[PDB]
Amino acid sequence: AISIKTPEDIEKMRVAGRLAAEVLEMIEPYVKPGVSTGELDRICNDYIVNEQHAVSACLGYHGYPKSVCISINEVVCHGIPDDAKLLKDGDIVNIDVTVIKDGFHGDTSKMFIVGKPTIMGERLCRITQESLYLALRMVKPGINLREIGAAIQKFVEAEGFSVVREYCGHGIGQGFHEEPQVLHYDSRETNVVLKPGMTFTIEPMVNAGKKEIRTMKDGWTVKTKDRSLSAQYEHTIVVTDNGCEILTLRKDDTIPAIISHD
Numbered sequence: 001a002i003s004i005k006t007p008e009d010i011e012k013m014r015v016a017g018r019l020a021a022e023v024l025e026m027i028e029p030y031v032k033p034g035v036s037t038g039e040l041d042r043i044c045n046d047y048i049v050n051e052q053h054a055v056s057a058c059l060g061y062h063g064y065p066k067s068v069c070i071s072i073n074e075v076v077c078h079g080i081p082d083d084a085k086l087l088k089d090g091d092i093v094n095i096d097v098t099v100i101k102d103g104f105h106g107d108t109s110k111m112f113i114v115g116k117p118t119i120m121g122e123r124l125c126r127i128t129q130e131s132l133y134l135a136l137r138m139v140k141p142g143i144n145l146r147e148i149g150a151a152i153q154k155f156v157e158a159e160g161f162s163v164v165r166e167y168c169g170h171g172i173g174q175g176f177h178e179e180p181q182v183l184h185y186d187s188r189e190t191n192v193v194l195k196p197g198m199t200f201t202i203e204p205m206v207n208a209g210k211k212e213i214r215t216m217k218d219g220w221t222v223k224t225k226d227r228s229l230s231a232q233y234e235h236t237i238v239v240t241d242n243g244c245e246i247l248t249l250r251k252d253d254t255i256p257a258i259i260s261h262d
């Protein structure tokens with residue numbers, strides 16, 4: 001079932017959350033044309049282990065071979081870092097990090113634009129982030145998760161894009177992927193009322209083209225069926241008494257860390 005975090009649990013999540021956020025802040029300068037994704041993965045891993053004294057939740061999870069997930073352009077999610085995959089001007093890339101500290105998980109991701117952005121690329125990233133922010137602003141006790149997925153969907157579709165159905169947000173804590181499943185679209189199947197102390201991620205994947213996706217033979221990599229660009233952003237949050245707190249907020253986020261309702 002859905003686990004409710006204690007205040008002590010929450011304090012541990014703030015640390016793990018901030019650690020994950022920090023890897024993203026740190027890597028930025030390395031994201032440039034000509035760098036390989038395998039190299040970004042090594043830099044991230046070194047930092048996590050050697051400086052942070054933490055651990056990557058990804059390494060070995062169901063056999064996942066690397067420390068972070070790096071998805072370029074049409075890759076939806078779960079792209080596997082590789083020494084052979086070099087970044088080019090105009091690429092949009094997602095770096096998804098999940099760190100474990102004192103047994104608690106922190107899961108977050110953001111898009112990076114390599115070199116000179118393309119119009120589509122910039123637009124897609126922006127809209128994707130806005131859709132995540134919109135959802136964040138709605139979080140509060142008593143509301144049904146269904147409403148959030150529906151708002152994201154309506155927003156995204158209104159902008160001419162599509163939302164991926166298959167992958168979604170999830171509870172997180174001592175476990176990497178806990179209940180509940182956080183859908184990024186409107187579904188009659190969803191019936192979950194939020195309560196304070198719940199911790200979960202929101203991580204909408206938006207496609208410039210059609211919603212359909214396909215899983216690669218590697219068993220992890222996900223791509224759009226039509227090869228259109230896909231973007232994603234992710235934050236880990238905790239439901240509070242009058243709103244929410246964003247555990248993985250970064251210096252470049254433009255949303256406040258604590259959102260209060262009244």
Ligand SMILES: CSCC[C@H](N)P(=O)(O)O
Nearest residue numbers: 058061064069096098107
């Ligand atoms: C190789 S497991 C990686 C899982 C991602 N952090 P997420 O739970 O955001 O999809």
Ligand SMILES: [Co+2]
Nearest residue numbers: 096107108234
């Ligand atoms: Co993630």
Ligand SMILES: [Co+2]
Nearest residue numbers: 107201203234
């Ligand atoms: Co996640």
Ligand code: NA
Nearest residue numbers: 072073075230
């Ligand atoms: Na992508």
